[PDB]
């Protein structure tokens, strides 16, 4: 079953969490036909199945105070479900999440017009959809081709068959609108670590999505980044409600390691095939500085700018060195800069990263040359 990562986004209380619940119970009740919790160890991470696909779903909180949290997640989404209440219509955080979505590159967005159980005016609904499409278009998303499902997450969760049908329609779009993601299975194994929980009588288990390759039980691995590189052996692989012998590219899993204590592995480090990736502190890069037009800074920054650099599952402070003669960087400029991180991160040429500072996204770049 192909694995696809999705999630819920949208304004505070528009119905993200309820919808997540409605999706799992309607799908289990309709197509329904173990202490294993890989990524589900995280409360906002669920898993469910449609007839031909398996989904990893991250339910995001809608308050601006929590924007950080969803970034590392949205960046891993193959597609996102935008929840918008028909009552309120688009709100401030509907805008921000769409914006963040565009900045990190979420490839597809499906809309669930929620709380329609509270609205009887077909004209009201048409108007709201219309403005949701324009809002999407304003952020460079296919507003006119965007599937919009009119439903009620609450009535569906409560068992109302007429509304449950809308949940299935939504699931249908997840299956049809989001293309099957390509997986780098023929590359050396790599998995960025998100959660790290200890299981009594088993050792430590790290979770995350397998970026590329395959990790099989019995194979040895390295833990690279932040701390000094360590070595270990994969004693097991799990998923929500099942045990496996392998972890494949594109799959969200939990990996058991032997001889490693919970306090020796942390978020941000990566699990990898021995000797295939190294930790670096300094590197060169081609970075694009968002314009105000795109939600970036309104002013130029100078030498010694110390923003946060987002690499895979974590972010880390870094200092910037500018090109000889260059005194400032303007919003909207493309520039080559040498970056020095406060601590090492596993990387190689080509690795993408985002730059965030002061509550917003300032840049999007890629590692050009590793130095450290
Ligand atoms: C582990 C972290 C990984 C991160 C990476 O992810 C992954 N997955 O690795 C990132 Cl790094 C990706 O690799 C980046 C990527 O792929 C690139 O392609 C970027 O996507 C590309 C360079 C960007 Cl950044 C495009 C931004 C477009 C923005 C638009 C079109 C905004 C429209 C705004 C309209 C508006 O009206 O805004 C109002 C008014 C506005 C004002 O004008 O004032 C202010 C804001 C308001 O909302
Ligand atoms: N009438 C109606 N109420 C709904 C519907 N979906 C959710 N609600 C209600 O609206 C409220 C918010 O629901 P919730 O799922 O927690 O919202 P959220 O978007 O996850 N909130 P947050 O941004 O904090 O994470 C709850 O009182 C819930 O019962 C719906 O389809 N119809
Ligand atoms: Mg919620």
Curated annotation (Swiss-Prot):
Gene Ontology BP terms: response to antibiotic; translational elongation
UniProt region (G2), positions on chain: 38-42
Modification note: The N-terminus is blocked.
Effect of residue 93 to A: Weaker binding for GDP and for EF-Ts
Topology with respect to the bilayer: Peripheral membrane protein
Modified sites of kind N6-succinyllysine: 29, 155, 227, 231, 273, 292
N6,N6-dimethyllysine sites (modified residues): 35
Effect of substituting residue 117 to N: Reduces affinity for GDP; increases affinity for XDP
Modified residues (N6-methyllysine): 35
Alphabetic keyword roster: Acetylation, Antibiotic resistance, Cell inner membrane, Cell membrane, Cytoplasm, Elongation factor, GTP-binding, Hydrolase, Magnesium, Membrane, Metal-binding, Methylation, Nucleotide-binding, Phosphoprotein, Protein biosynthesis, RNA-binding
Result when mutating residue 356 to A: 60% loss of Qbeta viral RNA polymerase elongation activity
Catalytic activity: GTP + H2O = GDP + phosphate + H(+)
Sequence segments annotated as region (G3): 59-62
Impact after mutating residue 267 to A: 50% loss of Qbeta viral RNA polymerase activity
Region described as G1: 10-17
Chief location of this protein within or outside the cell: cytoplasm
Subcellular localization: Cytoplasm; Cell inner membrane
Positions of post-translational N6-acetyllysine modification: 292
GO MF term (any one): GTP binding
Matches recorded under InterPro entries: EF-Tu_GTP-bd, EF-Tu_GTPase, EFTu-like_2, EFTU_2, G_TR_CS, P-loop_NTPase, Small_GTP-bd, T_Tr_GTP-bd_dom
Entry-linked PANTHER family: ELONGATION FACTOR TU, MITOCHONDRIAL, ELONGATION FACTOR TU-RELATED
General remark: In order to produce high amounts of bacteriophage Qbeta RNA polymerase catalytic core, a fusion protein consisting of tsf-tufB-replicase with a cleavable linker between tufB and the viral replicase subunit is frequently used.
Function in brief: GTP hydrolase that promotes the GTP-dependent binding of aminoacyl-tRNA to the A-site of ribosomes during protein biosynthesis. May play an important regulatory role in cell growth and in the bacterial response to nutrient deprivation.
Protein name: Elongation factor Tu 2
Originating species: Escherichia coli (strain K12)
């Amino acid at each position: 079953k192909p694995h696809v990562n999705v999630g819920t986004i949208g304004h505070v209380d528009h119905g993200k969490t309820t919808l997540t619940a409605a999706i799992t119970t309607v799908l289990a009740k309709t197509y329904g036909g173990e202490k294993a919790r890989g990524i589900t160890i995280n409360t906002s991470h669920v898993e469910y199945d449609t007839p031909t696909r398996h989904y990893a779903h991250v339910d995001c909180p809608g308050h601006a105070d929590y924007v950080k949290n969803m970034i590392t997640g949205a960046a891993q989404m193959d597609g996102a479900i935008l929840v918008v209440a028909a009552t309120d219509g688009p709100m401030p955080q509907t805008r921000e999440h769409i914006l963040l979505g565009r900045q990190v590159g979420v490839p597809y967005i499906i809309v669930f017009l929620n709380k329609c159980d509270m609205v009887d005016d077909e004209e009201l609904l048409e108007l709201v959809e219309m403005e949701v499409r324009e809002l999407l278009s304003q952020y460079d998303f296919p507003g006119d081709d965007t599937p919009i499902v009119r439903g009620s997450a609450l009535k569906a969760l409560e068992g109302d068959a007429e509304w449950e049908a809308k949940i299935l329609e939504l699931a249908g779009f997840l299956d049809s609108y989001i293309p099957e993601p390509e997986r780098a299975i023929d590359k050396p194994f790599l998995l960025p670590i998100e959660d790290v929980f200890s299981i009594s009588g088993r050792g430590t288990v790290v979770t995350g999505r397998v970026e590329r390759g395959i990790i099989k039980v019995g194979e040895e691995v390295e833990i690279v980044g932040i701390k000094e590189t360590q070595k270990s052996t994969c004693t097991g692989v799990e998923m929500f409600r099942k045990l496996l012998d392998e972890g494949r590219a594109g799959e969200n899993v939990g990996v058991l390691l032997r001889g490693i204590k919970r306090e020796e592995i942390e978020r941000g480090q990566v699990l990898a095939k021995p000797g295939t990736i190294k930790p670096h502190t300094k590197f060169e890069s081609e970075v694009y500085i968002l314009s105000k037009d795109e939600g970036g800074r309104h002013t130029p920054f100078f030498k010694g700018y110390r923003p946060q650099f987002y690499f895979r599952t974590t972010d880390v402070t870094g200092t910037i060195e500018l090109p000889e003669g260059v005194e400032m960087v303007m919003p909207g400029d493309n520039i080559k800069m040498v970056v020095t991180l406060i601590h090492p991160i596993a990387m190689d040429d080509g690795l993408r990263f985002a730059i965030r500072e002061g509550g917003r996204t300032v840049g999007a770049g890629v590692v050009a040359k590793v130095l450290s």
